[PDB]
Amino acid sequence: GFPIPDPYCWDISFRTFYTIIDDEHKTLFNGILLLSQADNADHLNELRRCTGKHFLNEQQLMQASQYAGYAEHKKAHDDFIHKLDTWDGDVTYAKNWLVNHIKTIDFKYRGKI
Amino acid sequence: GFPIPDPYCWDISFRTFYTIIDDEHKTLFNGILLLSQADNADHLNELRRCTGKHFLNEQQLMQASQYAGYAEHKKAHDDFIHKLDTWDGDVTYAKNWLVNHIKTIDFKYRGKI
Amino acid sequence: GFPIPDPYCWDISFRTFYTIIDDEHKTLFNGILLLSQADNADHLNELRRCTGKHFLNEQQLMQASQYAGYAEHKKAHDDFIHKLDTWDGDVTYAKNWLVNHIKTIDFKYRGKI
Amino acid sequence: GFPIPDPYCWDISFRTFYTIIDDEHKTLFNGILLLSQADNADHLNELRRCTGKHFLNEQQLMQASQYAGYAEHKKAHDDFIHKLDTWDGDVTYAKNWLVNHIKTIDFKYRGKI
Amino acid sequence: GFPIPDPYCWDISFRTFYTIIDDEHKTLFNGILLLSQADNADHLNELRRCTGKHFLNEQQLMQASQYAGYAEHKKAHDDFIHKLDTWDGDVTYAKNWLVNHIKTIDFKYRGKI
Amino acid sequence: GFPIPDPYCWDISFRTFYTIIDDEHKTLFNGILLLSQADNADHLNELRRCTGKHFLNEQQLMQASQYAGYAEHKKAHDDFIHKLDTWDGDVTYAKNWLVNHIKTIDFKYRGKI
Amino acid sequence: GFPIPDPYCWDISFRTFYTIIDDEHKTLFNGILLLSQADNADHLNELRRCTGKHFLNEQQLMQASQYAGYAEHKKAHDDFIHKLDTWDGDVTYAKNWLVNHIKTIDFKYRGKI
Amino acid sequence: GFPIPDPYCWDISFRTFYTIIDDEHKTLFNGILLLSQADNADHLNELRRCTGKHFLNEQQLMQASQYAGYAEHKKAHDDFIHKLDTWDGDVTYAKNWLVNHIKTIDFKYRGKI
């Protein structure tokens, strides 16, 4: 269980050392930051697009090395997409989800993909 | 319910702001315009090729961000392909279909893909 | 002197037999038709973007087979860009230039690239 | 003079309508925010990598449509890189430079590339 | 029912006007020509590789425009692969099959893909 | 049944004449060599990543020419992945498996893909 | 002096072990055989397109490994293009030139690219 | 002065954190080990191909982020190629050069590209 950065922006503690992945993650941080300022549709579309794109790219990256933890990782991703598709305004959940997802599930593939 | 441009050619009111998508749409406008001048096989092949290519590309673009409205959008596309594969010479239907498809279904993904 | 279509849209007489080239060409017809409707910045941008992109892509196709007429063709394209970048509103010139460019200069690469 | 966001993160007012460009831009906001938190080599590397990559990619997008403002834009980008390669810690300059670059120089290519 | 070229090499009567497709077809002609000179394994491997590659590429090309005649065309291809995988030395069959396949089935997609 | 190179590193007797394939194989040799020095997780992750990547790439290469021996070859690959996912420290098995796999199963596709 | 095949088609003695290169080479044999049948513009176009494309692609393969014989090889290719661009109908020269080019100059890059 | 591995193979101390770079580096260790076993043309070709390809690819990675140390790094690589193109059999030099190149010059781009 990890601290929540305030302002809710990416920092180097989240580095995975996959620069594409890090740069995509910076966009998910910003997406949740916007929602945290104004819970509207422009902001949710922005987070949703970036989330869908990042999860699919990262999924491809895992598949390229036939990663053993893919299926568990894809199921995590798909549950979060689902929250976003039924958004409830729960920004705290999202701030939390992303921090733990990166620092636990994404950190797990390092060196394996 | 939108006006039908006369001559039946693309205009900037159809811009989606995805330049690839706009350029592909210009070819569907021209395809229906040819048919409207001469309902023959060279012209239907031309529209059919451009339609099949555009729908698949746009479908890929939607898939890249895991778009929530994909399945409804693909079903729309597939119904129109089907009309083209059983062409009946109904050019008015086609002039209409395309205008509404862009201005309603395609305009819906803007900002999300 | 080739006939100028009316409406100024692409027709199958312009076919080069390269489907990507033909699809790009349709966007150049459309750009000149919009300017003929309203000589403004939006329309000139649309045409200028599509012209720049088509000229570059067709140049790349030429280079891929080390086409012997490349230099002369590139020079023809660059001269038209200049005209678009110093636009004086002469739509008639543009309408003519495109019809003659396709049917005499683009048609000469058929079978060689 | 445009307002400087606080927190210094991207917002939808910076939208260019090119999703890849906007996603890159978010990483430049983030790089300058990290430096504002701690002026060190890690943070400067992160910003400098993301700036180098975004400038190159946006230059390639410009070239693909033979954008007429390419030279001047490239020169603006190269001048900023120089500032990053001779970094003196002036975060205020950087914060300003990015906001003005996006809203005045990047915004001028919209519709042309 | 078409003539069999002697020597069994491609000629311009087989042009489909898809240069990639034509160049791949030239390799199938050569493959059958080798077998016709020496029915051995080096020669069958050579034809088999080129055949498998060409059929898959051409299948992709058909899929890119959602070609209506794909399934019939793929079934043709797959039957010929199968003959090659159970080769019987019947070179006349192969000389024949290829000529008709191109001039009837492949000529059918022209203008549609 | 082939000799095991000592030191357990690739040599030109393993050349398949597909340079991509050879270069990937060099990484599997090194992976087993590390494990042979220290049976730890950094080393198994390294072999596992390289193995998964190589098997998928080689599988793609086979698929591109519709290789007849694909399914048998993929089943071989998938069994070895499975050993690696349930590693038992049996380095001798692995030194052996790889030598025979290349010199028998991989050597079989030469000239066919 | 290597033997000149009759019919002037590629055979497995010309194998370079690079499947894309060998497949391109087959199209150069074919281009010279067509000219030997009928010295016309169609045939010369076919050969000239395939020669330009093969020379460029093989040059790109050379460059990808920073091949030390690149300059000399490129010069050999450019000299042949010149001969095709100043075509005098000397098919015998062409037949010889290709056999010697492959077996002495192309064969020297084997294992180095 | 860094230690020279024995056997002269890559180990995880050489990790750059760029998986493609690390996989290429393994092929350079292998090339120098083969030469240490037998100083012949086959082995020198293998090393020289892998060195040329790795240097080019790593140069392209550097350029993609407009890496400020590009020029100096390229010069280091070009000097080694020269040594390989004027090979005198000094394997000791090579063994040293690679260890120092990776651990001092390649390591300096980490986080910047």
PDB file of C-alpha atoms in Angstrom, chain A residues 7 9-12 15 19 23 26-27 30 33-34 37 42-43 46 49-50 53, chain D residues 7 9-12 15 19 23 26-27 30 33-34 37 42-43 46 49-50 53:
ATOM      1  CA  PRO A   7      -0.406  16.799  -6.980  1.00  0.00           C
ATOM      2  CA  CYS A   9       1.137  13.460 -11.295  1.00  0.00           C
ATOM      3  CA  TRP A  10       3.590  10.823 -12.221  1.00  0.00           C
ATOM      4  CA  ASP A  11       6.993  10.800 -10.487  1.00  0.00           C
ATOM      5  CA  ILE A  12      10.213   8.782 -10.993  1.00  0.00           C
ATOM      6  CA  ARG A  15       9.516   4.219 -13.446  1.00  0.00           C
ATOM      7  CA  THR A  19      10.124   4.426 -21.572  1.00  0.00           C
ATOM      8  CA  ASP A  23       5.244   7.891 -21.002  1.00  0.00           C
ATOM      9  CA  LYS A  26       2.073   9.861 -17.314  1.00  0.00           C
ATOM     10  CA  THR A  27      -1.094  10.250 -19.409  1.00  0.00           C
ATOM     11  CA  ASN A  30      -3.033  13.436 -15.930  1.00  0.00           C
ATOM     12  CA  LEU A  33      -5.872  14.633 -12.265  1.00  0.00           C
ATOM     13  CA  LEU A  34      -8.385  16.308 -14.672  1.00  0.00           C
ATOM     14  CA  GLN A  37     -10.574  19.018 -10.980  1.00  0.00           C
ATOM     15  CA  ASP A  42     -14.231  15.878 -21.806  1.00  0.00           C
ATOM     16  CA  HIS A  43     -12.093  14.709 -18.901  1.00  0.00           C
ATOM     17  CA  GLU A  46      -9.488  11.793 -22.165  1.00  0.00           C
ATOM     18  CA  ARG A  49      -8.928   6.898 -24.428  1.00  0.00           C
ATOM     19  CA  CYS A  50      -5.474   6.947 -22.756  1.00  0.00           C
ATOM     20  CA  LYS A  53      -4.685   2.607 -25.462  1.00  0.00           C
TER      21      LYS A  53
ATOM     22  CA  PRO D   7      -0.353  22.542 -10.823  1.00  0.00           C
ATOM     23  CA  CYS D   9       0.047  19.906 -15.749  1.00  0.00           C
ATOM     24  CA  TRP D  10      -1.594  19.703 -19.137  1.00  0.00           C
ATOM     25  CA  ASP D  11      -5.311  20.600 -19.373  1.00  0.00           C
ATOM     26  CA  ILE D  12      -7.777  20.321 -22.265  1.00  0.00           C
ATOM     27  CA  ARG D  15      -5.675  20.237 -27.043  1.00  0.00           C
ATOM     28  CA  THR D  19      -4.047  12.600 -29.978  1.00  0.00           C
ATOM     29  CA  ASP D  23      -0.179  12.600 -25.250  1.00  0.00           C
ATOM     30  CA  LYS D  26       1.454  15.748 -21.330  1.00  0.00           C
ATOM     31  CA  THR D  27       4.943  14.255 -20.823  1.00  0.00           C
ATOM     32  CA  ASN D  30       5.203  16.412 -16.347  1.00  0.00           C
ATOM     33  CA  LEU D  33       6.645  19.841 -12.986  1.00  0.00           C
ATOM     34  CA  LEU D  34       9.267  17.321 -11.700  1.00  0.00           C
ATOM     35  CA  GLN D  37       9.788  19.865  -7.413  1.00  0.00           C
ATOM     36  CA  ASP D  42      17.039  12.428 -13.063  1.00  0.00           C
ATOM     37  CA  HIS D  43      14.334  14.970 -13.677  1.00  0.00           C
ATOM     38  CA  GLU D  46      13.280  12.662 -18.154  1.00  0.00           C
ATOM     39  CA  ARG D  49      14.345  12.618 -23.397  1.00  0.00           C
ATOM     40  CA  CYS D  50      10.606  13.455 -23.732  1.00  0.00           C
ATOM     41  CA  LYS D  53      11.370  12.625 -28.812  1.00  0.00           C
TER      42      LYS D  53
END
